[PDB]
Design a protein around this ligand. Structure first.
Ligand SMILES: COc1cc(Oc2ncnc3cc(OC)c(OC)cc23)ccc1CC(=O)Nc1cnn(C(C)C)c1
Length: 298
């Protein structure tokens, strides 16, 4: 389940331990078959008496031992990564006295995909809260920064997509992973492939055909995320169902054409992210340096 690191071998700093009786649960932000993310109020998480809104990931009673081990591994990985500006930040956890609760910072504007879809009509390519090309380039940069950080920590996301990016204050995007808190059975972006329901349209050929996930396969999905970003939340390979013809076309070298709002130099990034040879793909660090140059020129 993890390519380079082994989360079961990662420690869990009890500095994160928070008493669950100090959490007041609110609305469900997202839910899957086995897990959910709930909005909560954490009393006494701040040094003063002040309460704060947090997001809490937990398992449902439908969950088995596999999901239980997975939520604990996720907590260890989040604790191991530590705080990064572009990654959703762990604030605490509840491991004693009941089911595992993973507590993170609450992100004001939800997932990037829904935000882009809500802002599709209030978009200005030129430089109320109008979305612009400057915002999209900044989101692309922040996601590449967060992913460069994850790769430096020998972490592979395996599900990089606009649906797994959160938007908070000051146009700050944060990489997250809904995982078990996403209803993948009813999400048309996850296809039935063998025993699994997989996000095939975001997946590198080697992940589809050989089940290999690497730094380079995350780069491929970043290319797809770029496409979704500069199409303002449109589904990738539009009008194309995931079938035999799709797998054939990907293996044969078919690639999406540029989305409507992508600068040529961003599309250049996408093309290289989609190289059939993983060794010819750029690293996230190379991508950061490229976008940085584009922002400076702008
Ligand atoms: C509590 O934990 C989570 C909470 C999440 O959801 C939200 N978190 C904050 N604010 C939200 C605001 C919303 O609307 C206002 C919201 O509306 C649907 C969901 C929100 C999403 C994911 C997780 C776990 C997680 O990211 N784990 C993980 C594993 N690996 N990584 C690596 C670093 C990539 C991250």
């Amino acid at each position: 389940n993890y390519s380079y690191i082994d989360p079961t071998q990662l420690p869990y700093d009890h500095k994160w331990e928070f008493p669950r009786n100090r959490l007041s649960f609110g609305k469900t932000l997202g839910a899957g078959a086995f897990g959910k993310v709930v909005e909560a109020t954490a009393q006494g998480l701040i040094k003063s008496d002040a309460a704060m809104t947090v997001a809490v990931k937990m398992l449902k009673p439908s969950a088995h031992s596999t999901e239980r081990e997975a939520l604990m591994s996720e907590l260890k990985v989040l604790s191991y990564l530590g705080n990064h500006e572009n990654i959703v930040n762990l604030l605490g956890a509840c491991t004693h006295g009941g089911p595992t609760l993973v507590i993170t910072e609450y992100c004001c504007y939800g997932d990037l995909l829904n935000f882009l879809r809500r802002k599709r009509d209030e978009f200005v390519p030129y430089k109320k809260d109008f979305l612009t090309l400057e915002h999209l380039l900044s989101f692309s940069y922040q996601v590449a920064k967060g992913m460069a950080f994850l790769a430096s920590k020998n972490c592979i996301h395996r599900d990089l997509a606009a649906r797994n990016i959160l938007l908070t204050h000051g146009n700050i995007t944060k990489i997250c992973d809904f995982g078990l808190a996403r209803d993948i059975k009813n999400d048309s972006n996850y296809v039935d492939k063998g025993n699994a329901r997989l996000p095939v349209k975001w997946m590198a050929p080697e992940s589809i055909f050989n089940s290999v996930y690497t730094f380079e396969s995350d780069v491929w999905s970043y290319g797809i995320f770029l496409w979704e970003l500069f199409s303002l939340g449109s589904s990738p390979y539009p009008g194309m169902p995931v079938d035999s013809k799709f797998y054939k076309m990907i293996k044969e070298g078919f690639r999406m054409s540029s989305p409507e709002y992508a600068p040529a130099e961003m599309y250049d990034i996408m093309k290289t992210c989609w190289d059939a040879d993983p060794d010819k793909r750029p690293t996230f660090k190379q991508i950061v340096q490229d976008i940085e140059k584009q922002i400076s020129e702008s």
